[PDB]
Design a protein around this ligand. Structure first.
Ligand SMILES: *[C@@H]1O[C@H](CO)[C@@H](O[C@@H]2O[C@H](CO)[C@@H](O[C@@H]3O[C@H](CO[C@H]4O[C@H](CO[C@H]5O[C@H](CO)[C@@H](O)[C@H](O)[C@@H]5O)[C@@H](O)[C@H](O[C@H]5O[C@H](CO)[C@@H](O)[C@H](O)[C@@H]5O[C@H]5O[C@H](CO)[C@@H](O)[C@H](O)[C@@H]5O)[C@@H]4O)[C@@H](O)[C@H](O[C@H]4O[C@H](CO)[C@@H](O)[C@H](O)[C@@H]4O[C@H]4O[C@H](CO)[C@@H](O)[C@H](O)[C@@H]4O)[C@@H]3O)[C@H](O)[C@H]2NC(C)=O)[C@H](O)[C@H]1NC(C)=O
Ligand SMILES: O=C(OCc1cc(Cl)cc(OC(F)(F)F)c1)N1C[C@@H]2CN(C(=O)c3ccc4[nH]nnc4c3)C[C@@H]2C1
Ligand SMILES: [Ca+2]
Ligand code: NA
Ligand SMILES: [Zn+2]
Length: 804
């Protein structure tokens, strides 16, 4: 109950939120229906408009005016944003020459450059180039400051998950806002887009920037604005706040614009109706900069222009219906649209079965515009699984399409021409980033990056220590002139053993056989050097990965590859090798097809065995270093060591064999040699983090050989491809993947065809950042390069997307 008897006299846009039963006067009280009776009268004045005209100059202060042009307004902090221009011969900020801000030029009393975040809903990355003619202010920001060609949002590319990711540095799975419309089975509660349950704090996880600031003594403006507060009034309120006394004045502010998302939904991303919303946003930006200039803050404040997601062309006629697939359509609940989430309509239904649902939605029509997934099988790069609010069954919808339950859901809810929410690697979903101010660089273009990295940088800009988040702190230091945070490499926790020859062949009882008893100090002293690591500078280019957890493992050297073999998991954690541009692919000789050889450096008790794979009818095996790429017939025998073997489903062996036989060489050819690090990943609780040994849910039948959930590879070469990978003097180039280890290829609809038609498409879908692999393996890569650590962090957050 709000007894709204109180008044907003002198409290307009107050910064402390007073609760019931006192009435509120803050920028969100409208959305709660709790404002004082006089809020509109006093706080939302509109009289005379938003601009000064020549005839208002020096006027008598009329307090009913929306903003003022009276002589005392600068002292009151409440002039119209164009006051100095109209009434004092000043120029607009946009007409001024771009001039480098080498140091902050702040008014007395300003302890640190304030941060203003100007966030725009649905601002597609291509708008920067395509709308450039109608956005002079935004274009000046972009070209004078620091900018990326685009910024990558999180999945789902919806508004709330993305805005709250911006504020927290967390994936939606971790911050808890995993979509628009959510059901929490523990709360037994529903979060609705329109309603008052969404105002319950229990939904919102992590620690948003405004809370981080407050807890560390930095004051914050209030980030959220009621829709009915017009943008001009939002800007004036921010400017008024900036004129508060030093002890009362916030250091961080946010403005939000519902455009261009609002119009883009109606008219499509490039409808001709879209030009005016872009002009208007630019005008708003112009007013802010004019206002900052009036306050002498335009060479003091750091301004971030940032979007939440883009916008794609989507229409009613591009809808798939679950009723054209399922018979039991009424037994399911569907969260519909640009993504699909499915659960049982009733929990008292023991006949509900997700396996038959997924099967009915799998590869059923030739042009099917969505793909069903159990959430744990989603590409790991989406990080969209580890939350009770994310339904087991997910549909990844093709760009430009919708999924709905039944046709009646659409025509009785064309209404729209644009939408968003698709896979965050989709070009149309990319959004913008510009930073302008003393702390950002001057006229600098930076590579595209993910929006999860921004929280750390905003904390840096404000002198704050970030809450634990999913950014990689330091990976954006190249955006900044100063304030850089100087990260150090994590300490290695486990050091390796370096085993020599300790076991005789006959001590092993692995059920393995090999036709290798085929038989001189020339090339026998030579193979001793190879087992001690003489070729190691060729195959281990960036140092050994560091093991960041407590474990027991052996470094094993070979002519063609090097591995860190885990005595705990009975397989390498990583296998490293270099394939030059001139390397030749060979075949596995007829007699060596089923060859597996004991490794005399590693005890029988810490080895796999062939018997387990013989008895396990579902499970076969593969090799991490590919026998096809051996440098010599004799070297090839190394590739058949039991310590290079890993468990693989026959269906996955199809994928893995093609990668090793065909793609690695193709990459070596294209990139002038590659270094490859491959290995297993265990993530049985789909939390994106390495499993401990007691968390493994499946072993090769009858054994302690754990079955990986995924297999990764990291493929590095020289950015300057005129230098071979193994002799690179400068920056590196990387692409990686995390392939799901599945017993079937149901994910690939063309899998009955030749691997050359479907394997590489699958791999690109499961593209990954090195950083994703670090989380999943507890390893730290690139420990020894000639590059700066910050540059390595950037490399580690890179994602090769394969968009055009
Ligand atoms: C992306 O980055 C994020 C952020 O770093 C990573 O997520 C973090 O990962 C950590 C490791 O998994 C995890 O540590 C947990 O913490 C458990 C309790 O955590 C609660 O408190 C969190 C902090 O809030 C406070 O933060 C500051 C200080 O930093 C304080 O000053 C403030 O006052 C804050 O209150 C809080 O954020 C977290 O909230 C979650 O749950 C809320 C609802 O309950 C949501 O609103 C919120 O959004 C969070 O929801 C996410 O996270 C939970 C996991 O907590 C997850 O289930 C959801 O799906 C969702 O994803 C909590 O309220 C702590 O109990 C854990 O300790 C267990 O494990 C250790 C392992 O050694 C054991 O020693 C220990 O015994 C214990 O085990 C016990 O429980 C077992 C299982 O129940 C049981 O079997 C066993 O027998 C024991 O009883 C552990 O340390 C963080 O919680 C998590 N943080 C966040 C914000 O999500 C994430 O990993 C990154 N992603 C990637 C891919 O890298
Ligand atoms: O002004 C807003 O957004 C500024 C912003 C918000 C973040 Cl989180 C990060 C940002 O970007 C960043 F971080 F980069 F600065 C910028 N919003 C205004 C709109 C109307 N609206 C609500 O009224 C609302 C909905 C749920 C709530 N739960 N609790 N209060 C709530 C209010 C939601 C919309 C978004
Ligand atoms: Ca895990
Ligand atoms: Na298939
Ligand atoms: Zn939208």
């Amino acid at each position: 109950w709000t007894a709204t008897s109180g008044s907003c006299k002198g409290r307009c846009f107050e910064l402390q939120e007073v609760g019931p039963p006192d009435c509120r006067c803050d920028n969100l009280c409208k959305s709660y229906s709790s404002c004082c009776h006089d809020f509109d009268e006093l706080c939302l004045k509109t009289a005379r408009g938003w601009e000064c005209t020549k005839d208002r100059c020096g006027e008598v202060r009329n307090e009913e005016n929306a903003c003022h042009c009276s002589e005392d307004c600068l002292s009151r902090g409440d002039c119209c944003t164009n006051y100095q221009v109209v009434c004092k011969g000043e120029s607009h900020w946009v007409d001024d020459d771009c001039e480098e801000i080498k140091v902050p030029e702040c008014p007395a009393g300003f302890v640190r450059p304030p941060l203003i975040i100007f966030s725009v809903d649905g601002f597609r990355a291509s708008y920067m180039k395509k709308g450039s003619k109608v956005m002079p202010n935004i274009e000046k920001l972009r070209s004078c400051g620091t900018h990326a060609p685009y910024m990558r949002p999180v999945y789902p590319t919806k508004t709330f998950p993305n805005l709250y990711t911006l504020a927290t540095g967390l994936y939606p799975e971790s911050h808890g806002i995993v979509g628009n419309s959510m059901y929490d089975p523990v709360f037994d509660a529903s979060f609705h887009l329109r309603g008052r349950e969404k105002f319950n704090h229990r939904w919102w996880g992590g620690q948003p920037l405004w809370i981080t600031a407050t807890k560390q003594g930095v004051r914050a403006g209030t980030f959220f604005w009621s829709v009915s507060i017009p943008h001009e009034r939002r800007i004036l309120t921010i400017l008024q706040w900036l004129s508060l006394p030093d002890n009362e004045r916030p250091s961080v502010y946010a403005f939000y614009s519902e455009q261009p998302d609002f119009s883009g939904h109606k008219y499509g991303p490039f409808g001709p109706e879209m030009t005016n919303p872009l002009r208007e946003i630019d005008k708003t930006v112009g007013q802010l900069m004019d206002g900052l200039k009036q306050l002498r803050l335009h060479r003091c404040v750091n301004v971030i222009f940032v979007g939440d997601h883009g916008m794609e062309d989507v229409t009613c006629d591009r809808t798939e219906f679950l009723s054209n697939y399922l018979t039991n359509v009424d037994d399911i609940t569907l969260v519909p649209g640009t993504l699909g989430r499915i659960r049982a309509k009733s929990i008292n239904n023991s006949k509900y079965d997700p396996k038959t649902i997924i099967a009915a939605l799998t590869c059923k029509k030739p042009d099917q515009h969505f793909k069903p997934y159990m959430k744990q099988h989603l590409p790991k790069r989406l990080h969209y699984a580890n939350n009770r609010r994310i339904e087991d069954i997910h549909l990844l919808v093709d760009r430009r399409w919708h999924v709905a339950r039944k046709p009646l859901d659409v025509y009785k809810k064309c209404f729209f021409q644009g939408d968003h929410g698709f896979d965050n690697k989709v070009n149309s979903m990319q959004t913008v980033f510009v930073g302008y101010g003393p702390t950002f660089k001057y006229r600098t273009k930076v590579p595209p990056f993910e929006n999860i990295e921004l929280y750390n940088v905003m904390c840096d800009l404000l002198g704050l220590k970030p809450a634990p988040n999913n950014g990689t702190h330091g990976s954006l230091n190249h955006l900044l002139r100063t304030n850089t945070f100087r990260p150090t490499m994590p300490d290695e926790v486990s050091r390796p053993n370096y085993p020599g020859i300790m076991y005789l062949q006959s001590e092993f009882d692995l059920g393995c056989t090999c036709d290798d008893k085929v038989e001189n100090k020339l090339e026998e002293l030579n193979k001793r050097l190879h087992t001690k690591g003489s070729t190691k500078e060729r195959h281990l280019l960036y140092g050994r990965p560091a093991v960041l957890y407590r474990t027991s493992y052996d470094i094993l050297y070979h002519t063609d590859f090097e591995s860190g073999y885990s005595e705990i998991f009975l397989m390498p954690l990583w296998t490293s090798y270099t394939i030059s541009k001139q390397a030749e692919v060979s075949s596995i000789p007829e007699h060596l097809t089923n060859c597996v050889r004991p490794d005399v450096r590693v005890s029988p008790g810490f080895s796999q065995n062939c018997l387990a794979y013989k008895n396990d009818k579902q499970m076969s095996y593969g090799f991490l270093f590919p026998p096809y790429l051996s440098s010599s017939p004799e070297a090839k025998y190394d590739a058949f060591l039991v310590t290079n073997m890993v468990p693989m489903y026959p269906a996955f062996k199809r994928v893995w064999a093609y990668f090793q036989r065909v793609l690695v060489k193709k990459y070596a050819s294209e990139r002038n040699g590659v270094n490859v690090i491959s290995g297993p990943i265990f993530d049985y609780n789909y939390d994106g983090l390495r499993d401990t040994e007691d968390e493994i849910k499946q072993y090769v039948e009858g054994s302690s050989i754990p079955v990986p959930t995924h297999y990764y590879s990291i493929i590095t070469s020289c950015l300057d491809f005129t230098q071979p990978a193994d002799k690179c003097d400068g920056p590196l180039s990387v692409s990686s993947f995390i392939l799901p280890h599945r017993p079937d290829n149901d994910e690939s609809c063309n899998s009955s065809e030749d691997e050359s038609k479907w394997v590489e498409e699958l791999m690109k879908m499961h593209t990954a950042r090195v950083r994703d692999i670090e989380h999943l393996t507890g390893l730290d890569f690139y420990r020894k390069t000639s590059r700066s650590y910050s540059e390595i962090l950037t490399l580690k957050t890179y994602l090769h997307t394969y968009e055009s």
